[model samples]
Target: MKSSIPITEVLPRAVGSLTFDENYNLLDTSGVAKVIEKSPIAEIIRKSNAELGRLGYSVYEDAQYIGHAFKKAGHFIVYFTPKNKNREGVVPPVGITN
Candidate 1:
């Protein structure tokens, strides 16, 4: 089995999330591919400062949830969350990982 950190907290809260490679090939999704497919998530990840083992943040805010990018297992994993967790309004600033 593929083992990794369990992000049970993120699943239900995430607006849209997915994992992809450096080449922009989608790997996995959290049932919101259509919403995420339009964003530049992959491109942002590639442009991020993340190195082989260094952490970086390639994120941006728009009218929707703020986008977050994380790197692991030689791939890029990204997610989006609402700007205001309380009001559930527009987007906000968005992270880093190795």
Candidate 2:
């Protein structure tokens, strides 16, 4: 999928995480690779921040929320807050287990 969206910032941590698949396999996203290969530091940071925003997180913030959303399917409990620093003090809609 070719995205025409210009990347303003990209971070090493963000890019590094996505470079590998869920099973730690390398991805074949040539577009991403090309960007990372030639993009400047500012551009990389901007792109990373933009992508993180789309994923429902803020790069400037100290905390983050991690969870799965299954559209069109019933809800299920995964984990609860106070367990992870990212989701501390925040209550999920469903019953989250520890």
| Predicted candidate 1 versus true structure: per-residue lDDT over 60-79, tens digit per residue | 45666655565666777665
- Candidate 1 runs further than 4 Å off: 1-13, 31-33, 49-58, 84-98
Could you tell me every candidate's TM-score relative to the true structure? 0.54, 0.19
lDDT of candidate 2 at residue 25, scale 0 to 100: 37
Candidate 2 Cα misplacement greater than 4 A, ranges: 1-19, 35-98
Residue range with the least summed lDDT across 10 consecutive positions in model 1: 1-10
Top TM-score model: 1
The local lDDT score (0 to 100) that residue 70 gets in candidate 1 is 59
- Candidate 1 lDDT: 0.52
Q: Model 2: per-residue lDDT, tens digit, 1-98?
A: 11111122122112222232322233433322333322232233344433432222221221232221111112111111111333133332322325
